[PDB]
Amino acid sequence: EEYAVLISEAQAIKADLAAVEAKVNRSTALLKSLSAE
Amino acid sequence: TEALYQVGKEFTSKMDLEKPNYIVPDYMPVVYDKLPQPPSHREAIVNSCVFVHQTLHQANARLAKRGGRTMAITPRHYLDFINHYANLFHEKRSELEEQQMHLNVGLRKIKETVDQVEELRRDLRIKSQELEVKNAAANDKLKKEEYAVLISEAQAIKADLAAVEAKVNRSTALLKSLSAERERWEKTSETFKNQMSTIAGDCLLSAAFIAYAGYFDQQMRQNLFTTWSHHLQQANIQFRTDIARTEYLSNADERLRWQASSLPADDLCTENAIMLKR
Amino acid sequence: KEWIPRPPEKYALSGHRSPVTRVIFHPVFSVMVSASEDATIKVWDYETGDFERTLKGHTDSVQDISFDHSGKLLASCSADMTIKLWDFQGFECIRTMHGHDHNVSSVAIMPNGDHIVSASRDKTIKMWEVQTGYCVKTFTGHREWVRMVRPNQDGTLIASCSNDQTVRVWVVATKECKAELREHEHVVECISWAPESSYSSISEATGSETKKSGKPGPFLLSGSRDKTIKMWDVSTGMCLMTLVGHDNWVRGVLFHSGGKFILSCADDKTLRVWDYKNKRCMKTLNAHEHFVTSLDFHKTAPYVVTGSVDQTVKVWECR
């Protein structure tokens, strides 16, 4: 019962991890674009 | 008297001054001799204007009898009186119409808001039902990889429901705050029709005060105002007996500004400032 | 005359802060008057598209406006339950006749220029006096909200369209519904009668037989939300022809000044000009980005104006 709750907590953790990874990639692409500036 | 009545009729011809439900009193204070026997509302208004002009002559005669100092009352006083009457009527009517328009828009917005509160109720119910079925399916399929995906979707639905509940309580807090505002606006909108009916008498009294009562002291200003009010009562012309003339002829911002200009905090001084304004 | 609007425009007047409800043409001056939902009536110069003035006496949304034969008075109705009469020389409200419970929908001055008619949600049509302002007689018989009211060319006959699917023609003298028409599929919204310049053009368009007097009789028309435009005989009460093809609810209908073509608007965001004698003209002309509300045809000038929900009034050239 609680095991499903904790694996779903792990799923939320991976969703946050994916969001952070996407933000990192996007901001790195932005930084590469502003090198000339 | 005939010339005054004709000037009043011709000048106030484009003023509304029409009351279909006007009730002719049994004893009309007939000032103009050739006034029609069943006079209309406009005719009564012009008769009241002529009465005010003659009341100024009576007051000047009384001051002369008591050995006081008097200024001549010329037809230019009557012309100023009717100018002030027309201007005050137009200004008050426009202000009240604009206020009622604003209040109607606000009440309509509040009603749309509460309907949207109901729509958020039904949206929240649907969201809760789908969350219940989602986690029921999750628990069913988890006691037998996609199961993790669907329980993640269950948490997504839970987060959406939490956000919707935050919108729920925030909106409900906003509606409860505007209960007093909506109550006051509804009361004022209901009393709008009564306020429209008293514009003629109130504007007549205020215009007479501005045009005539400038030179006199407070005692005879009050005497003239009481005489005009009694004549309006005898002619069945509606006017407000609750509001003060200083409050009627000025807004609180102007009164605050005048006090910053060292105007004494007196009713007579406020009336004098109003006369210096209008 | 073969005046027909063209897709290109000249001015798209946009001064209203709320959807426009009706637009009319001044009888004599080069003035176009638009009533909108922001409780204001605006005055425009359609020849050069210049804003002129606004009449802001109304409290709630203004619904219908109407001039008289001389164009010296403007009668307006609004949702504030009142009829305001405007003096077009000075542009100041002169008489505000009260009564007529709930939202007032339509208003019209019959050509005699001394009395007004008005339609409202209270399921009745009232009859006012311009000179005095008392409602003298009241028309009853409509069981629902009456939408539009239009009189005749000599101040004797009145038609009223309502939500009750009935377009009842009324008589001034007898106050009796001599013609009652309940045949539409869905809500009837707009009506407009036939000028005498088109009475002859209906004989060969429909094949109707003249009576012993020989006159074809007064003619009717009623547009409805069922996307169908139907023209009706006031004298008899039977159908002449049903005009079908509108995509959405129709809101305004009127006849060409030459009495040859049918020109109307609807909620389909387009203006549609239809021929009925030969069914040749079927021009469809988009007018606004949103719903189109009302329209009018100039009696002599080659101009047509349209009001829409997008708070914009547009003028089209007739060619």
XYZ file of C-alpha atoms in Angstrom:
634
model
C 0.000 0.000 0.000
C 2.610 2.533 1.110
C 5.055 0.907 -1.326
C 2.958 2.205 -4.222
C 3.051 5.639 -2.576
C 6.847 5.591 -2.350
C 7.376 4.332 -5.905
C 5.053 7.123 -7.063
C 7.218 9.487 -5.006
C 10.185 8.154 -6.989
C 8.205 8.845 -10.172
C 7.700 12.441 -9.034
C 11.441 12.633 -8.347
C 12.183 11.483 -11.895
C 9.707 14.022 -13.293
C 11.531 16.772 -11.393
C 14.851 15.370 -12.633
C 13.637 15.469 -16.243
C 12.398 19.041 -15.798
C 15.764 20.096 -14.353
C 17.620 18.336 -17.184
C 15.483 20.087 -19.807
C 16.051 23.443 -18.098
C 19.809 22.791 -18.015
C 19.875 21.950 -21.724
C 17.760 24.982 -22.638
C 19.844 27.413 -20.591
C 23.096 25.942 -21.923
C 21.798 26.449 -25.464
C 20.906 30.027 -24.514
C 24.408 30.611 -23.119
C 26.029 29.249 -26.279
C 23.918 31.717 -28.276
C 25.079 34.752 -26.249
C 28.827 34.068 -26.472
C 29.269 36.677 -29.216
C 27.213 39.211 -27.251
C -44.365 88.194 -13.556
C -45.391 87.369 -17.129
C -41.929 88.279 -18.428
C -40.249 86.143 -15.762
C -42.530 83.201 -16.546
C -41.888 83.494 -20.290
C -38.123 83.715 -19.744
C -38.272 80.638 -17.522
C -40.353 78.678 -20.031
C -38.170 79.563 -23.016
C -34.882 78.957 -21.201
C -35.887 75.687 -19.493
C -37.593 74.331 -22.618
C -34.827 71.803 -23.349
C -34.649 70.701 -19.716
C -36.599 67.505 -19.121
C -38.828 68.814 -16.298
C -41.539 66.312 -17.306
C -43.359 64.316 -14.619
C -46.321 62.419 -16.126
C -47.475 61.348 -12.640
C -47.468 64.908 -11.276
C -50.261 65.465 -8.743
C -51.729 68.974 -8.813
C -52.285 70.247 -5.254
C -55.719 71.554 -4.340
C -54.295 74.972 -3.387
C -51.627 75.798 -5.959
C -49.427 78.736 -4.890
C -50.414 80.678 -8.005
C -47.767 83.348 -8.629
C -48.321 83.911 -12.357
C -51.929 84.975 -12.912
C -52.318 83.489 -16.406
C -50.964 80.088 -15.342
C -53.148 77.212 -16.612
C -55.665 75.950 -14.071
C -54.415 72.321 -14.194
C -50.718 73.216 -14.428
C -48.143 70.677 -15.549
C -44.842 69.879 -13.842
C -42.802 72.231 -16.043
C -45.291 75.046 -15.461
C -45.049 74.466 -11.707
C -41.242 74.581 -11.922
C -41.302 77.901 -13.778
C -43.865 79.244 -11.304
C -41.491 78.272 -8.489
C -38.662 80.127 -10.243
C -40.802 83.268 -10.494
C -41.752 82.843 -6.832
C -38.073 82.707 -5.856
C -37.354 85.904 -7.778
C -40.234 87.700 -6.041
C -39.198 86.277 -2.657
C -35.888 88.095 -3.068
C -37.810 91.362 -3.500
C -39.810 90.592 -0.356
C -36.609 89.909 1.601
C -35.024 93.150 0.391
C -38.158 95.041 1.431
C -37.972 93.442 4.883
C -34.320 94.447 5.313
C -35.170 97.981 4.193
C -37.992 98.092 6.746
C -35.678 96.937 9.548
C -33.231 99.679 8.482
C -30.699 97.314 6.918
C -28.609 97.506 3.763
C -29.916 95.931 0.555
C -28.621 95.307 -2.951
C -30.904 95.710 -5.947
C -32.418 92.529 -7.385
C -32.309 92.877 -11.171
C -33.456 90.578 -13.997
C -29.799 89.574 -14.354
C -30.267 87.783 -11.030
C -33.111 85.795 -12.608
C -30.971 85.032 -15.657
C -28.158 83.771 -13.423
C -30.704 81.720 -11.476
C -31.988 79.947 -14.580
C -28.446 79.517 -15.952
C -27.447 77.847 -12.683
C -30.612 75.734 -12.738
C -29.910 74.405 -16.233
C -26.214 73.796 -15.548
C -26.849 72.051 -12.220
C -29.620 69.903 -13.706
C -27.398 68.759 -16.572
C -24.383 68.151 -14.322
C -26.260 66.222 -11.625
C -28.150 64.139 -14.193
C -24.934 63.241 -16.024
C -23.121 62.371 -12.789
C -25.926 60.147 -11.511
C -26.335 58.404 -14.875
C -22.596 57.702 -15.055
C -22.565 56.420 -11.470
C -25.482 54.075 -12.149
C -23.779 52.824 -15.322
C -20.615 52.049 -13.347
C -22.647 50.277 -10.658
C -24.532 48.206 -13.241
C -21.254 47.102 -14.830
C -19.847 46.160 -11.426
C -22.924 44.148 -10.453
C -22.876 42.331 -13.798
C -19.204 41.479 -13.266
C -19.965 40.128 -9.782
C -22.819 37.962 -11.096
C -20.591 36.564 -13.848
C -17.992 35.919 -11.150
C -20.356 33.865 -8.989
C -21.489 31.875 -12.037
C -17.834 31.094 -12.668
C -17.558 30.074 -9.020
C -20.299 27.515 -9.703
C -18.499 26.383 -12.864
C -15.327 25.853 -10.822
C -17.452 23.795 -8.415
C -18.458 21.445 -11.224
C -14.920 21.382 -12.654
C -13.558 20.415 -9.224
C -16.151 17.653 -8.891
C -15.177 16.221 -12.289
C -11.478 16.449 -11.402
C -12.048 14.632 -8.106
C -14.058 11.887 -9.821
C -11.378 11.289 -12.444
C -8.664 11.292 -9.768
C -10.644 8.674 -7.836
C -11.019 6.417 -10.866
C -7.348 6.946 -11.793
C -5.983 5.901 -8.406
C -8.497 3.041 -8.219
C -7.132 1.736 -11.522
C -3.592 2.318 -10.234
C -4.211 0.243 -7.108
C -5.957 -2.468 -9.137
C -3.170 -2.793 -11.714
C -0.421 -2.486 -9.086
C -1.523 -5.582 -7.133
C -1.510 -7.971 -10.106
C 6.471 -0.211 -16.027
C 3.230 1.255 -17.359
C 1.929 1.101 -13.783
C 4.564 3.628 -12.709
C 3.580 5.848 -15.646
C -0.097 5.778 -14.696
C 0.586 6.410 -11.003
C 2.705 9.381 -12.103
C -0.328 10.550 -14.079
C -2.316 10.067 -10.866
C 0.060 12.422 -9.046
C -0.268 14.855 -11.956
C -4.053 14.789 -11.538
C -3.585 15.289 -7.789
C -1.395 18.347 -8.406
C -3.970 19.730 -10.845
C -6.705 19.160 -8.255
C -4.629 20.948 -5.607
C -4.133 23.927 -7.927
C -7.864 23.945 -8.695
C -8.612 23.878 -4.952
C -6.277 26.837 -4.440
C -8.206 28.658 -7.164
C -11.408 27.579 -5.383
C -10.566 29.048 -1.996
C -8.874 32.158 -3.420
C -11.904 32.957 -5.585
C -14.332 32.229 -2.749
C -12.365 34.589 -0.515
C -12.615 37.254 -3.220
C -16.395 36.820 -3.565
C -17.022 37.070 0.175
C -15.095 40.350 0.336
C -17.313 41.962 -2.324
C -20.532 41.098 -0.473
C -20.736 44.510 1.204
C -19.813 46.222 -2.070
C -22.498 44.347 -3.999
C -25.060 45.073 -1.269
C -24.330 48.809 -1.319
C -24.342 48.889 -5.124
C -27.673 47.053 -5.265
C -29.204 49.458 -2.738
C -27.966 52.492 -4.676
C -29.111 51.022 -8.002
C -32.565 50.421 -6.529
C -32.695 53.997 -5.221
C -31.453 55.400 -8.562
C -34.999 55.961 -9.827
C -35.964 57.956 -6.728
C -32.824 60.107 -7.000
C -33.663 60.949 -10.621
C -37.068 62.265 -9.535
C -35.635 64.771 -7.026
C -33.076 66.371 -9.358
C -35.456 69.135 -10.461
C -36.301 70.458 -6.999
C -32.802 70.016 -5.581
C -31.226 71.791 -8.551
C -33.808 74.584 -8.360
C -33.047 75.156 -4.673
C -29.273 75.000 -5.162
C -29.366 77.329 -8.177
C -31.517 79.820 -6.278
C -29.070 79.693 -3.365
C -26.055 80.243 -5.630
C -27.652 83.061 -7.630
C -29.463 84.961 -4.861
C -28.376 84.150 -1.298
C -24.776 85.315 -1.752
C -25.102 88.766 -0.197
C -27.117 87.873 2.907
C -26.028 86.518 6.283
C -26.732 82.984 7.491
C -30.061 83.890 9.111
C -31.676 85.302 5.985
C -29.976 82.736 3.751
C -31.765 80.131 5.870
C -34.998 82.146 5.741
C -34.887 82.297 1.936
C -34.046 78.598 1.664
C -36.915 77.689 3.998
C -39.339 79.875 2.032
C -38.315 78.227 -1.242
C -38.553 74.749 0.294
C -42.034 75.477 1.653
C -43.181 76.752 -1.741
C -41.795 73.644 -3.445
C -43.624 71.493 -0.892
C -46.892 73.331 -1.559
C -46.473 72.751 -5.317
C -45.822 68.989 -4.928
C -42.297 69.275 -6.344
C -40.010 66.558 -5.014
C -36.735 67.632 -3.417
C -34.371 66.025 -0.922
C -34.685 67.435 2.603
C -31.899 65.262 4.062
C -28.754 66.435 2.244
C -27.015 69.708 3.062
C -26.550 72.262 0.298
C -22.801 72.467 0.933
C -22.584 68.683 0.562
C -24.802 68.770 -2.534
C -22.922 71.529 -4.376
C -19.381 70.282 -3.687
C -17.391 67.068 -3.376
C -15.214 66.168 -0.406
C -12.010 66.567 -2.431
C -12.840 70.209 -3.159
C -13.650 70.838 0.506
C -10.304 69.328 1.524
C -8.518 71.470 -1.069
C -10.240 74.630 0.183
C -9.193 73.875 3.765
C -5.616 73.613 2.502
C -6.209 77.114 1.073
C -7.018 78.454 4.574
C -10.784 78.445 4.073
C -12.473 78.586 7.503
C -14.304 75.400 8.493
C -17.709 77.073 8.383
C -20.899 76.306 6.485
C -21.246 79.922 5.343
C -17.604 79.981 4.231
C -18.132 76.735 2.310
C -21.195 78.223 0.607
C -19.175 81.332 -0.256
C -16.443 79.155 -1.775
C -19.076 77.283 -3.792
C -20.401 80.611 -5.082
C -16.840 81.639 -5.958
C -16.633 78.360 -7.901
C -19.998 78.123 -9.705
C -30.928 51.061 -58.998
C -28.276 48.283 -59.006
C -26.302 49.576 -56.034
C -24.357 46.572 -54.688
C -21.708 46.610 -51.921
C -18.144 45.737 -52.900
C -15.614 43.719 -50.856
C -13.224 46.692 -50.516
C -14.068 49.169 -47.763
C -13.498 52.878 -47.182
C -13.609 53.338 -43.390
C -13.771 50.868 -40.500
C -14.936 53.140 -37.684
C -13.887 51.885 -34.234
C -14.634 54.160 -31.292
C -17.030 52.009 -29.303
C -15.694 50.152 -26.266
C -18.512 47.572 -26.424
C -20.204 45.576 -29.206
C -22.291 47.642 -31.616
C -26.006 46.838 -31.554
C -27.508 48.875 -34.408
C -26.540 51.369 -37.113
C -28.864 53.720 -39.012
C -28.611 56.481 -41.612
C -29.762 60.054 -41.138
C -32.672 60.887 -43.482
C -31.183 64.135 -44.848
C -27.713 64.832 -43.451
C -24.503 62.957 -44.246
C -24.565 61.501 -40.741
C -24.463 57.868 -39.609
C -25.589 56.983 -36.080
C -24.468 53.844 -34.237
C -25.874 52.491 -30.969
C -23.647 50.121 -29.002
C -23.679 48.150 -25.758
C -21.616 50.682 -23.753
C -24.734 52.809 -23.074
C -23.560 55.375 -25.650
C -24.769 56.450 -29.087
C -22.060 57.697 -31.443
C -22.427 59.972 -34.470
C -20.261 59.519 -37.566
C -19.796 61.141 -40.973
C -19.910 58.185 -43.361
C -18.656 60.251 -46.315
C -15.236 60.755 -44.688
C -15.463 58.428 -41.679
C -14.942 61.088 -39.003
C -16.221 60.721 -35.456
C -18.548 63.605 -34.606
C -20.065 63.259 -31.121
C -21.540 60.854 -28.585
C -24.827 60.838 -26.665
C -24.053 59.310 -23.259
C -27.370 59.783 -21.451
C -28.330 56.106 -21.313
C -27.658 53.915 -18.278
C -27.447 50.379 -19.709
C -26.658 49.006 -23.158
C -28.457 50.838 -25.963
C -30.402 48.417 -28.160
C -32.239 50.224 -30.965
C -32.288 53.754 -32.386
C -34.626 55.352 -34.903
C -35.072 58.699 -36.637
C -38.301 60.326 -37.782
C -39.235 61.527 -41.264
C -37.655 64.961 -40.756
C -34.578 63.606 -38.964
C -34.917 66.228 -36.219
C -35.528 63.689 -33.426
C -33.782 60.481 -32.381
C -35.595 57.841 -30.327
C -33.436 55.372 -28.414
C -34.144 52.306 -26.289
C -31.853 50.529 -23.855
C -31.731 47.773 -21.243
C -32.350 50.373 -18.506
C -36.113 50.027 -19.156
C -36.437 53.517 -20.657
C -37.017 55.261 -23.982
C -34.940 58.410 -24.490
C -35.904 60.979 -27.126
C -32.980 63.005 -28.468
C -33.171 66.468 -30.035
C -30.830 66.157 -32.997
C -30.393 69.926 -33.397
C -28.715 70.289 -29.999
C -27.976 66.607 -29.319
C -29.418 66.751 -25.798
C -31.942 64.369 -24.269
C -35.297 66.126 -23.991
C -37.770 63.452 -22.831
C -37.209 60.151 -21.010
C -40.422 58.113 -21.017
C -40.453 55.420 -18.324
C -42.396 52.213 -17.832
C -42.366 49.204 -20.148
C -40.926 46.754 -17.636
C -37.659 44.867 -18.244
C -35.209 45.194 -21.162
C -36.546 47.217 -24.094
C -35.487 45.675 -27.404
C -36.799 47.811 -30.278
C -38.055 51.328 -30.963
C -39.525 53.048 -34.005
C -41.180 56.348 -34.905
C -44.024 55.990 -37.382
C -43.901 58.435 -40.311
C -46.575 60.732 -38.857
C -43.854 61.824 -36.427
C -45.999 62.277 -33.313
C -45.971 58.843 -31.628
C -43.503 56.034 -30.900
C -43.682 52.248 -30.682
C -41.408 50.055 -28.591
C -40.845 46.353 -27.902
C -39.420 44.755 -24.773
C -38.984 41.582 -22.718
C -42.271 42.182 -20.869
C -44.150 40.530 -23.757
C -45.901 43.696 -24.905
C -45.553 46.596 -27.335
C -46.351 50.076 -26.038
C -47.487 53.238 -27.814
C -46.058 56.563 -26.652
C -46.586 60.195 -27.630
C -43.602 62.271 -28.731
C -45.233 65.563 -27.745
C -46.347 64.586 -24.226
C -44.766 61.275 -23.217
C -47.693 59.197 -21.893
C -48.218 55.602 -22.976
C -51.816 55.753 -24.192
C -52.449 52.216 -25.472
C -50.627 48.933 -24.887
C -50.415 45.982 -27.284
C -50.799 42.515 -25.757
C -50.849 39.061 -27.304
C -47.188 38.124 -27.585
C -46.374 35.407 -25.055
C -42.586 35.928 -25.032
C -39.807 38.463 -25.603
C -40.595 40.705 -28.583
C -37.389 41.435 -30.484
C -38.089 43.921 -33.294
C -40.970 46.242 -34.170
C -41.468 48.074 -37.483
C -44.362 50.286 -38.665
C -45.687 51.086 -42.147
C -45.067 54.044 -44.463
C -48.123 55.979 -43.221
C -48.380 55.204 -39.490
C -51.241 52.683 -39.435
C -49.813 49.127 -39.367
C -47.303 47.590 -36.944
C -45.508 44.233 -37.009
C -43.720 42.707 -34.022
C -41.413 39.685 -34.042
C -40.839 37.746 -30.830
C -39.212 34.627 -29.421
C -42.645 32.939 -29.474
C -42.209 32.177 -33.213
C -45.021 34.625 -34.047
C -44.856 37.764 -36.195
C -48.102 39.562 -35.353
C -49.210 42.534 -37.454
C -51.153 45.130 -35.466
C -53.504 47.995 -36.334
C -53.407 51.493 -34.843
C -57.145 52.161 -34.956
C -58.561 48.815 -33.808
C -55.634 47.494 -31.699
C -56.331 43.962 -32.953
C -53.930 41.424 -34.447
C -55.561 41.031 -37.857
C -52.662 38.874 -39.102
C -50.870 36.335 -36.896
C -48.038 34.288 -38.410
C -46.528 31.351 -36.481
C -44.623 29.202 -38.972
C -40.876 29.674 -38.388
C -38.574 26.827 -37.402
C -36.762 28.788 -34.678
C -36.514 32.229 -33.067
C -37.552 35.135 -35.298
C -35.203 38.079 -34.778
C -35.530 40.766 -37.482
C -38.324 42.188 -39.644
C -38.513 44.856 -42.354
C -41.350 45.761 -44.693
C -41.445 46.489 -48.437
C -41.243 49.964 -49.972
C -43.798 50.884 -52.610
C -40.951 50.871 -55.158
C -40.929 47.049 -54.977
C -44.657 46.226 -54.830
C -44.809 45.721 -58.600
C -41.610 43.644 -58.512
C -43.273 41.054 -56.259
C -46.017 40.191 -58.768
C -43.684 38.584 -61.313
C -41.368 37.320 -58.559
C -44.089 35.153 -56.970
C -47.093 35.036 -59.308
C -49.585 36.397 -56.775
C -52.995 37.437 -58.097
C -54.267 40.969 -57.539
C -57.550 41.382 -55.673
C -60.612 43.316 -56.849
C -59.024 46.576 -55.692
C -55.969 45.517 -57.711
C -53.368 46.430 -55.100
C -50.990 43.581 -54.165
C -51.412 44.614 -50.526
C -48.932 45.512 -47.793
C -45.931 43.204 -47.623
C -43.919 41.730 -44.765
C -40.637 39.978 -44.091
C -39.228 38.194 -41.040
C -35.722 36.859 -40.533
C -35.142 34.133 -37.970
C -32.317 32.300 -36.217
C -33.182 29.188 -38.276
C -30.928 30.628 -41.035
C -33.988 31.217 -43.248
C -35.316 34.527 -44.583
C -39.023 34.512 -45.436
C -41.137 37.257 -47.015
C -44.815 37.417 -46.103
C -48.073 38.942 -47.325
C -49.653 41.188 -44.697
C -53.035 41.205 -46.455
C -53.375 37.403 -46.628
C -50.728 35.806 -44.401
C -49.351 33.147 -46.774
C -45.792 32.473 -47.889
C -44.233 33.976 -51.011
C -40.718 32.500 -50.973
C -38.223 31.179 -48.427
C -34.620 32.347 -48.812
C -32.209 29.689 -47.533
C -28.419 29.566 -47.418
C -27.307 31.587 -44.399
C -24.695 29.791 -42.300
C -25.653 31.238 -38.904
C -28.411 33.179 -37.138
C -29.623 36.183 -39.126
C -29.791 39.472 -37.240
C -30.706 42.139 -39.800
C -32.775 42.305 -42.986
C -33.806 45.173 -45.252
C -34.670 45.880 -48.877
C -32.646 47.640 -51.545
C -33.810 51.208 -52.149
C -34.477 50.270 -55.775
C -36.656 47.373 -54.645
C -34.895 44.675 -56.668
C -32.406 42.824 -54.433
C -32.323 41.365 -50.919
C -29.431 42.413 -48.681
C -28.984 41.121 -45.142
C -26.502 40.247 -42.410
C -26.180 37.301 -40.050
C -23.971 35.720 -37.406
C -22.001 33.977 -40.193
C -19.527 36.914 -40.155
C -20.512 37.687 -43.763
C -22.894 39.946 -45.666
C -25.080 38.198 -48.237
C -26.950 39.873 -51.100
C -29.728 37.735 -52.577
C -32.000 38.027 -55.595
C -35.551 36.693 -55.338
C -37.254 37.529 -58.646
C -34.744 35.380 -60.556
C -32.423 33.898 -57.871
C -29.375 35.163 -59.769
C -27.601 37.370 -57.209
C -26.104 35.311 -54.368
C -23.068 37.413 -53.479
C -21.500 36.529 -50.124
C -19.260 39.213 -48.631
C -17.380 38.905 -45.355
C -17.595 42.048 -43.246
C -16.099 41.565 -39.777
C -13.822 39.216 -37.858
C -16.584 38.446 -35.330
C -20.400 38.312 -35.389
C -22.127 41.018 -37.440
C -25.061 42.645 -35.656
C -26.914 45.242 -37.755
C -26.801 47.131 -41.040
C -28.558 49.828 -43.047
C -28.983 50.976 -46.651
C -28.819 54.633 -47.650
C -31.961 55.780 -49.447
C -30.122 57.756 -52.144
C -26.378 57.536 -51.514
C -24.431 54.416 -52.593
C -23.412 53.517 -49.040
C -24.168 50.731 -46.569
C -23.013 50.523 -42.950
C -22.680 47.440 -40.757
C -22.288 47.101 -36.998
C -20.592 44.108 -35.412
C -19.678 42.610 -32.051
C -16.027 43.568 -32.655
C -16.783 47.167 -31.558
C -16.265 48.357 -35.146
C -18.573 50.004 -37.692
C -17.738 49.639 -41.384
C -18.931 51.494 -44.487
C -19.140 49.778 -47.881
C -19.347 51.376 -51.311
C -22.285 50.434 -53.524
C -21.392 49.839 -57.169
